[PDB]
Design a binder for this molecule. Structure first.
Ligand SMILES: O=c1ccn([C@@H]2O[C@H](COP(=O)(O)OP(=O)(O)O[C@H]3O[C@H](CO)[C@@H](O)[C@H](O)[C@H]3O)[C@@H](O)[C@H]2O)c(=O)[nH]1
Ligand SMILES: O=c1ccn([C@@H]2O[C@H](COP(=O)(O)OP(=O)(O)O[C@H]3O[C@H](CO)[C@@H](O)[C@H](O)[C@H]3O)[C@@H](O)[C@H]2O)c(=O)[nH]1
Ligand SMILES: CCCCCCCCO[C@@H]1O[C@H](CO)[C@H](O)C[C@H]1O[C@@H]1O[C@@H](C)[C@@H](O)[C@@H](O)[C@@H]1O
Ligand SMILES: CCCCCCCCO[C@@H]1O[C@H](CO)[C@H](O)C[C@H]1O[C@@H]1O[C@@H](C)[C@@H](O)[C@@H](O)[C@@H]1O
Ligand SMILES: [Mn+2]
Ligand SMILES: [Mn+2]
Lengths: 282, 282
């Protein structure tokens, strides 16, 4: 459930947070609109697990595996079982043009997988997320929407959950805003001028409550349709639109690049204590 | 309104948040349950003002002025007009045994004051807040509950608003938990053992959404009634109970001691960039 009566936490023994000791001094851990930026060392997962289990939280995870990308499902799902929301209720929604190619993956208790068949034609995921509206409202509390050509290597848990989140793109977290690859043509709905922008968010990992995710995906789909009607395609497709949306609708948490990393491309810099969810070649 | 459809922010020009530059390196700016701790330098008030004005947010402020404490109202209210939620809708609720002693204070536009008469007997504020339940639900989005023997000296605005907040007590923000003056007798409902506790919150400044404030004040009133029936009075009265509640129900923001300070007692230490709401002698 979200927003419902919250019962008392039980007694817990854990280290006292100390006001005059910051968790992390090397990174920004809160945005200027007071949204946490989630890095290792900023959260006590035991407190968070208690809070979310007491609400019997169910997390939906959407993933698209169309054409050759069905090959990525086995590693994606098997590593999700090891690292994604373990202990919580999880419902995977696998959208594919080849239901028979979905691997048979053994799931832990309280976890389920639904195969949803779609047509084969990246930019139409927004539309499909916004066919499933009624399904998701009835079945899960939060939605997490990710790319499939990825693997989990470390904990990805309830610390991410919030009404609306985006993830810092691993190539741009140190960049100034004029360097961000936002859509820069005023003719596109995704247009952001050079003096605007907080962050460059990656289209590969966003989420939130079902209501907020439906609002985002609806808005991005509508904006993409407008661009299509006007004969323009944003430079980075759905990611350009996601960036425009999150500029105008500030996320209530921001995930650090721990949550979307490419080790082949970018190595393992000092600012990353954990590499949680990472690109697979292709 | 709270929780309703959020329209898009307009274009804004402001400094880019930089991921590899923390706002503040000298203090903890997020709790281990991912609640912001509100210090100067952590928020862009222009972004927050936009967000809350777009929801037409109304803030209720409750204050009790019983017996000799009516003398504190003039400075309290006049300085609130200068510094508290300026630009937003505000409704003051002044609870007093002497309605005629309430000073005639000139209010800015969009601000109103109601005088509520009560009986003269600190611990019964929880009960009165939890007589007013229907009134507050109909009239305001957030409630802020404060002591009267105080003055505003600097900005106190929408950066504080969240479902549930407490404020760090100015005498104890650097203390280890065993030193906190929690109720330590197991016979009291307010009991917290020496190995538990995040922070020591002051009873003089707490708040949240109307729903969460009613939950807190109801729970504290019920706990205080149990203690009374058992012949025990918590060491710091309502503040002991507030501390127990916020241990078991984590606040979604924590205000730094900028928001409750005593300059006569504690001076102006380096960690405080602003002194916003401060004790008046008596
Ligand atoms: O033939 C395809 C092509 C794409 N996909 C799905 O769409 C996702 C995105 O495509 P992918 O090739 O992974 O794109 P990338 O270049 O790795 O990622 C960029 O492009 C994506 C789509 O615009 C955004 O989500 C990312 O943020 C952006 O970095 C894939 O993971 C799949 O889930 C398929 O299922 N089949
Ligand atoms: O005769 C009185 C006594 C108290 N009050 C009200 O109750 C508040 C609390 O009393 P006060 O004397 O200000 O208590 P303090 O010792 O300054 O504050 C401590 O006691 C309060 C009451 O337990 C808590 O709110 C504070 O966190 C705690 O620091 C006052 O500000 C008034 O609003 C009156 O109106 N008339
Ligand atoms: C060799 C490819 C270099 C890619 C560096 C930048 O990442 C790319 O950024 C684009 C926006 O400017 C868009 O998000 C695609 C993104 O490329 C994807 O993500 C990277 C981190 C790599 O995993 C890359 O292979 C992938 O295509
Ligand atoms: C001289 C008084 C010294 C008070 C220091 C500690 O503050 C007191 O803390 C108590 C809990 O341990 C409780 O909250 C009362 C609080 O005293 C109040 O707040 C202080 C900051 C002073 O303003 C004091 O005058 C006031 O009574
Ligand atoms: Mn990819
Ligand atoms: Mn006082």
């Amino acid at each position: 459930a979200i927003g419902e009566f919250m019962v008392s936490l039980p007694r817990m023994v854990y280290p006292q947070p100390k006001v005059l000791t910051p968790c992390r001094k090397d990174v920004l851990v809160v945005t200027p609109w007071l949204a946490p930026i989630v890095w290792e060392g900023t959260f006590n997962i035991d407190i968070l697990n208690e809070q979310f289990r007491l609400q019997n939280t169910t997390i939906g995870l959407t993933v698209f595996a169309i054409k050759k990308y069905v090959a990525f499902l086995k590693l994606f799902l098997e590593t999700a079982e090891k690292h994604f929301m373990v202990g919580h209720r999880v419902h995977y929604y696998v959208f594919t043009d080849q239901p028979a190619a979905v691997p048979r993956v053994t799931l832990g208790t309280g976890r389920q997988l639904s195969v949803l068949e779609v047509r084969a034609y990246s930019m139409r995921r927004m539309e499909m997320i916004s066919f499933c509206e009624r399904r998701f409202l009835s079945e899960v509390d939060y939605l997490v929407c990710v790319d499939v050509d990825m693997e989990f290597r470390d904990h990805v848990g309830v610390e991410i959950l919030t009404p609306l989140f985006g993830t810092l793109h691993p190539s741009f977290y140190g960049s100034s805003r004029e360097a961000f690859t936002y859509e820069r043509r005023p003719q596109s709905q995704a247009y952001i001028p050079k003096d605007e922008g907080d962050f460059y968010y990656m289209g590969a990992f966003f989420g939130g409550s079902v209501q907020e995710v439906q609002r985002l995906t609806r808005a991005c789909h509508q904006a993409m349709m407008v661009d299509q009607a006007n004969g323009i395609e944003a430079v980075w497709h759905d990611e350009s639109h996601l960036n425009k949306y999150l500029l105008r609708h500030k996320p209530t948490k921001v995930l650090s690049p721990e949550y979307l990393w490419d080790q082949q491309l970018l190595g393992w810099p000092a600012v990353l204590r954990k590499l949680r969810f990472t690109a697979v070649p292709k």
